[PDB]
Amino acid sequence: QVQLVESGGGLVQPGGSLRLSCVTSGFTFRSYAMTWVRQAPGKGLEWVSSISHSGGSTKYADSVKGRLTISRDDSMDTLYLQMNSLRAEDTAIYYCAKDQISYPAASPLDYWGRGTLVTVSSASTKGPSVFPLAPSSGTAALGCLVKDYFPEPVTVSWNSGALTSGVHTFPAVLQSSGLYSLSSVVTVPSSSLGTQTYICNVNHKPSNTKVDKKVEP
Amino acid sequence: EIVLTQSPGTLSLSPGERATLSCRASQSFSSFSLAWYQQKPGQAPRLLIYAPSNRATGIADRFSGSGSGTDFTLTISRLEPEDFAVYYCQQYGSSPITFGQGTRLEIKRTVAAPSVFIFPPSDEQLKSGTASVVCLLNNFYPREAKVQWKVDNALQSGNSQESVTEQDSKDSTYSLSSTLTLSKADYEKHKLYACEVTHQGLSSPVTKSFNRGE
Ligand SMILES: [Cl-]
Ligand SMILES: [Li+]
Ligand code: NA
């Protein structure tokens, strides 16, 4: 039951700092090298840094040397990444990963965390507006337009998770305004319209915006 | 550094078929220094095979690795719907660690025409001062699709954006949204809003439209 869970990401201004952490369980942490890998939105994997089991040997990608520092606390089973002087191009999901051996950057990465999103931008946090996509006047489509938010991510569910069949939640699009928008849609029986309640549940944790919106004809 | 280039960028295959994914290196190196990872959307990569063809925990025997020198191959026999993902190769025998750019394995399925829906801006949005018209193309294949917007028969060029889902887990289709942005004034000052969809599964383009205020 290896577990790796990252935290510390979020929106930060260029030149700013973040301290990422990865708490672990289910393996003898002090015995293994550990690694950070990042993935810019829509792009591939890029190795960032690795640290030996003892912390005595560290390795860095050239693009991050001197700005990012890897460290570990064996007594806390935690890996860290201290990020300073951040740049727009450091925007990425940051994954922590366990190496197979005690030496850094010299073996496969056998377990990975789900990652923490780091957004480096001068734009301010902004919560979305939630607008209905009402079903038209035997299947009907309806949805919610989640408009004008920053940074990513937004999540959408329907009927608090009870409605999953026929749901399509689209990837966000960056608008020319610099704000994101997405839509979530669902197809339902026309006969259900006006009787079955359809609610889209929108969460934008970066702005602590949470909305449940009834979508009606 | 060792550059790793994967090919093809996207591989479209039917379930039951054999996939051959290639990873080519700018310098020759040992098969014992190569690993492959599988990444599904919204998830982290997972170790697949390594050094050269040891399987990570939970990985089916249908995944195998071969090659030497500069040309390496991941073979997936009898593709199952779950094995569709982005695949990355990685070398760890020479500093710095490097990754291939990824190959996306897409599920080939039978051509399916989109069902098309159009949505006017909500009164709430107009009250807030903006207008978005949405065109939905539901459950189609292949991904290629043209959406043309017209307002009072004027072709709209440059003021729409599109977004496409990942392939559906159950039927391997795509869905697509196209959103037309127009000022509230432009919305209220024109009448007929139309989205016209061209797609391989349609014998001729389909148009969905509405008249504002009708
Ligand atoms: Cl070392
Ligand atoms: Li806000
Ligand atoms: Na068209």
Author numbering:
A (entry chain A): 1 to 137, 143 to 222
B (entry chain B): 2 to 215
Direct quotes from the study:
The bacterial pathogen Neisseria meningitidis, or meningococcus, binds several complement regulators, including human Factor H (FH). One of these proteins, which had been independently discovered as GNA1870 and LP2086, was found to bind FH and renamed Factor H binding protein (FHbp). FHbp was developed as a key antigen in two licensed meningococcal serogroup B vaccines. In the present study, we show that two vaccine-elicited antibody fragments (Fabs) isolated from different human subjects increase binding of complement FH to meningococcal FHbp by ELISA.
In addition, the 1.5 Å-resolution structure of one of the isolated Fabs defines the structural rearrangements associated with binding to FHbp. In the structure of the FHbp complex, CDR-L1 has five disordered residues, which are ordered in the Fab alone. CDR-L2 shows a backbone shift of up to 3 Å between the two structures.
